[PDB]
Amino acid sequence: ITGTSTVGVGRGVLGDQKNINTTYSTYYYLQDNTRGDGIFTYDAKYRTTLPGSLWADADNQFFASYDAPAVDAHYYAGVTYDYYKNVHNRLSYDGNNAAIRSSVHYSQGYNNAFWNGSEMVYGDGDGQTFIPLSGGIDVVAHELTHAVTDYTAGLIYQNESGAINEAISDIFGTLVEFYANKNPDWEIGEDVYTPGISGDSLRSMSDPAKYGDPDHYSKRYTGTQDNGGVHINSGIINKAAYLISQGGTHYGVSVVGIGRDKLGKIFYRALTQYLTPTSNFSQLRAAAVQSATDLYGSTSQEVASVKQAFDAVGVK
Numbered sequence: 530i531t532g533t534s535t536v537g538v539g540r541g542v543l544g545d546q547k548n549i550n551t552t553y554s555t556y557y558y559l560q561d562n563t564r565g566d567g568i569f570t571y572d573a574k575y576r577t578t579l580p581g582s583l584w585a586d587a588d589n590q591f592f593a594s595y596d597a598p599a600v601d602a603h604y605y606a607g608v609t610y611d612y613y614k615n616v617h618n619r620l621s622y623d624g625n626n627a628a629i630r631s632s633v634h635y636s637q638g639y640n641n642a643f644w645n646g647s648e649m650v651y652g653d654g655d656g657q658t659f660i661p662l663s664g665g666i667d668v669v670a671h672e673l674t675h676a677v678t679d680y681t682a683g684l685i686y687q688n689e690s691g692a693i694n695e696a697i698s699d700i701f702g703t704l705v706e707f708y709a710n711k712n713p714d715w716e717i718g719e720d721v722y723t724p725g726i727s728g729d730s731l732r733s734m735s736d737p738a739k740y741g742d743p744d745h746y747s748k749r750y751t752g753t754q755d756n757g758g759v760h761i762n763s764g765i766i767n768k769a770a771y772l773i774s775q776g777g778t779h780y781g782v783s784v785v786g787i788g789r790d791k792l793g794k795i796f797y798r799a800l801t802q803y804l805t806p807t808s809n810f811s812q813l814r815a816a817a818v819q820s821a822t823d824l825y826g827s828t829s830q831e832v833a834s835v836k837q838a839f840d841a842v843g844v845k
């Protein structure tokens with residue numbers, strides 16, 4: 530769309546009010562011209578055909594309940610773009626300011642969200658297991674990071690490489706949650722999952738076993754479900770990443786934490802410089818050690834922590 534950049538206001542899934550970047554041309558559209566080549570949000574109108582209609586609104590105010598998921602998908606995509614740019618100096622997911630597109634109200638009662646290789650897609654949830662998925666900044670950032678991985682390491686979506694791909698998305702979705710300072714934690718999806726139950730979440734990075742995911746390599750899943758457990762075995766890496774950041778003792782191995790910022794620097798370097806489509810856990814560890822080495826010196830504490838963390842989860 531060609532029009533005048535402006536700012537509108539609305540309410541998100543959780544009821545919070547926020548300002549969003551819109552474009553005016555007869556209607557006000559969810560098109561943010563301020564970030565790279567633009568952020569565009571579409572209405573899939575409960576269908577599965579994509580992307581749907583670019584989101585149009587008559588008055589630049591988005592307080593209808595049907596508006597909520599669009600407001601958040603649009604807003605959280607801006608935040609994530611900012612995170613990447615400000616913190617890692619990366620322009621959009623391709624490093625060249627590619628437009629970011631998302632569709633909301635995808636299908637009926639759809640309990641998931643995903644990056645399809647071209648854009649983001651968010652279901653509204655069935656109202657019991659989930660509420661509209663774009664209300665969780667960690668979910669939004671998890672999906673967008675899949676775009677980043679696709680353009681860089683290109684980790685294939687299955688077995689160990691696929692688990693690494695998933696872990697990368699949870700790690701960065703969590704870092705983004707901390708960046709925005711939106712009640713941050715080391716849990717995944719807590720804000721949109723089981724609205725009826727407080728205190729739970731989809732996955733836990735601090736204690737993956739809390740939900741039955743592995744927290745040690747000896748406990749990995751070897752079957753075929755979930756593409757070979759991409760969402761299961763990601764727990765081993767997630768745990769390693771939490772330990773690198775926060776420190777702790779796990780299975781008798783002690784790790785000194787080096788904090789979130791360095792965690793992000795180290796994993797982003799590994800991702801963009803050293804990982805390849807078929808990398809396995811053991812390769813991830815070498816990549817992570819090489820990155821810390823690059824960044825902090827081979828005799829650094831940082832390197833030492835990365836080593837300890839992987840030894841703690843049994844990845845050699």
Ligand SMILES: [Ca+2]
Nearest residue numbers: 586588590591
């Ligand atoms: Ca309106």
Ligand SMILES: [Ca+2]
Nearest residue numbers: 711712713714
């Ligand atoms: Ca949170």
Ligand SMILES: [Ca+2]
Nearest residue numbers: 667716717718
């Ligand atoms: Ca979270």
Ligand SMILES: [Ca+2]
Nearest residue numbers: 722723724726
């Ligand atoms: Ca819940």
Ligand SMILES: [Zn+2]
Nearest residue numbers: 671675695698
């Ligand atoms: Zn994912």
